[PDB]
Amino acid sequence: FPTEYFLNTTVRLLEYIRYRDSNYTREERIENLHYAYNKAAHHFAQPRQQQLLKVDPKRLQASLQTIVGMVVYSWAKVSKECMADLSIHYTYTLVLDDSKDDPYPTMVNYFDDLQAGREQAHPWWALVNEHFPNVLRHFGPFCSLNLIRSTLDFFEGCWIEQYNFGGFPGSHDYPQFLRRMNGLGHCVGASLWPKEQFNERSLFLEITSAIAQMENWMVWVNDLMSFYKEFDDERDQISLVKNYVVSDEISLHEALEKLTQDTLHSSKQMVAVFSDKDPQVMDTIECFMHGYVTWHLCDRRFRLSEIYEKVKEEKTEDAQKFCKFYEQAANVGAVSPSEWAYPPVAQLANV
């Protein structure tokens, strides 16, 4: 693991975007986390959900807490109900995100069943499409369409990843093709605009623009931040950075530099474009960018604490800047699970 370069790149990003999280007071944070967790926990504990969603209890629990954090930390302006419903949707996607399964058999009659209104054969689709209305009720038709497309894309992306194919050497378009596919970019981007707070028709151009630009910023930031948890992980391996290596036949070092440059430029344009636009829009965008980073630095899923410990000592400016940022984020989002994530889904299921 290029620890030395991981610190280099991460520091460049955090410093360039001027990472800082003022999204909530600690009381507000805990309050939202618990609300979202509580509703989702009861949802996933239902027998039907327990029966069709094939996932290890411990894994479901960890996935739910990771997503509640992501939603609460990054969608700081939407209502508690919206955070909760979104948390359920993104927990379904995270579960699929780490899974190993062959969709082929259950996708043979996908369209015909869809058109006829018959329950989907793939259990994931059966649960996701049944729950979807609870998510879409928060948005106008345009944003809703984006959520639907992006989730369908994501499903295809996880399907492709099952083949552990990083692209044919020379297939330069493959890496980003897959990343957009599995990125859930338009879903995340469009889910930032609840109709309760934003009028889809009045802000059509800014929202469309935000979806287009946020898609890349969002995915790339995760490619960089999650570069650590991914790397020695089997389910991953097939990633933008590693596919850049195989497909464009370049060095991991160059791949990371490529990713970092794109990310910095994406950040740059986010500012240029939205700085002088509707204040409410800029506010939501800012809350997302900052909270999104706080989430990557704190959440267990990305285990960046491991890199903190190993680097906490050595003083190389680059290593010190990382720990500073890591500490700053921890001071805001390092909330203990016992303060909000209870009771466990399992306990509610066996009730």
> If binding is defined by CB under 8 A, does position 250 make contact with its own copies?
no
Q: Is 308 helix (H, G, I), strand (E, B) or coil?
A: helix
- Considering beta carbons, is residue 9 or 213 the nearer one to its own copies? 213
Candidate residues 31, 81, 97, 113; the one interacting with Mg ion per rule CB under 5 A: 97
To Mg ion, the closest distance from the beta carbon of 96 in angstroms equals 8
Candidate residues 8, 49, 144, 182; the one interacting with Mg ion per rule CB under 5 A: 182
H helix runs in the chain, sequence order = 3-17, 26-45, 47-52, 57-74, 80-97, 104-107, 110-116, 123-136, 141-161, 174-182, 185-190, 204-225, 240-248, 252-274, 279-298, 304-312, 318-333, 345-349
> If binding is defined by CB under 8 A, does position 216 make contact with its own copies?
yes
Q: How many CB atoms lie within 10 A of CB 274?
A: 20
> If binding is defined by CB under 8 A, does position 104 make contact with its own copies?
yes
> If binding is defined by CB under 8 A, does position 279 make contact with its own copies?
no
- Considering beta carbons, is residue 185 or 194 the nearer one to Mg ion? 185
To Mg ion, the closest distance from the beta carbon of 125 in angstroms equals 17
To its own copies, the closest distance from the beta carbon of 212 in angstroms equals 4
Amino acid letter, 53? L
Residue 317 interacts, among Mg ion, its own copies, none and using kind-specific CB cut-offs from 5 to 8 Å, with none
> If binding is defined by CB under 5 A, does position 23 make contact with Mg ion?
no
Q: Report the C-alpha gap between 124 and 54 in whole angstroms.
A: 9
- Considering beta carbons, is residue 110 or 308 the nearer one to its own copies? 110
For residue 73 the two structure tokens come to: 């930390």
To its own copies, the closest distance from the beta carbon of 304 in angstroms equals 27
- Considering beta carbons, is residue 114 or 250 the nearer one to its own copies? 114
- Considering beta carbons, is residue 53 or 95 the nearer one to Mg ion? 95
* One-character DSSP codes across 230-252: SSS-SS-SSSHHHHHHHHHT--H
Residue 68: name the closest of 25, 22, 34 by CA: 34
Exposure on the CB side of residue 60, measured as CA atoms within 13 A: 22
Stretch 224-243 residues interacting with Mg ion (CB under 5 A) = 226
Q: Report the C-alpha gap between 38 and 65 in whole angstroms.
A: 10
Residue 2 interacts, among its own copies, Mg ion, none and using kind-specific CB cut-offs from 5 to 8 Å, with none
Q: Report the C-alpha gap between 273 and 322 in whole angstroms.
A: 28
Stretch 123-152 residues interacting with its own copies (CB under 8 A) = 129-130, 132-133, 136, 140-142, 144-146, 148-149, 152
Amino acid letter, 257? E
Q: Report the C-alpha gap between 247 and 48 in whole angstroms.
A: 42
* One-character DSSP codes across 182-205: HS-HHHHHHTT--TTT--TTTTHH
140: left (phi over 0), alpha (psi -120 to 50) or beta: beta
Q: Which residue is nearest to Mg ion (CB)?
A: 226
Peptide bond into 344 cis (omega under 30): no
Q: How many residues does the chain have?
A: 351
- Considering beta carbons, is residue 22 or 269 the nearer one to its own copies? 269
User: Residues annotated as binding site for Mg(2+)?
Assistant: 97, 161, 222, 226, 230, 236, 238
| Residues at the interface with its own copies (CB under 8 A) | 103-104, 107-108, 110-112, 114-118, 129-130, 132-133, 136, 140-142, 144-146, 148-149, 152-153, 155-156, 159-160, 163, 165, 167-174, 177-178, 200-201, 204-205, 208-209, 211-213, 215-216, 265-266, 269, 272-273
| Residues at the interface with Mg ion (CB under 5 A) | 97, 182, 222, 226
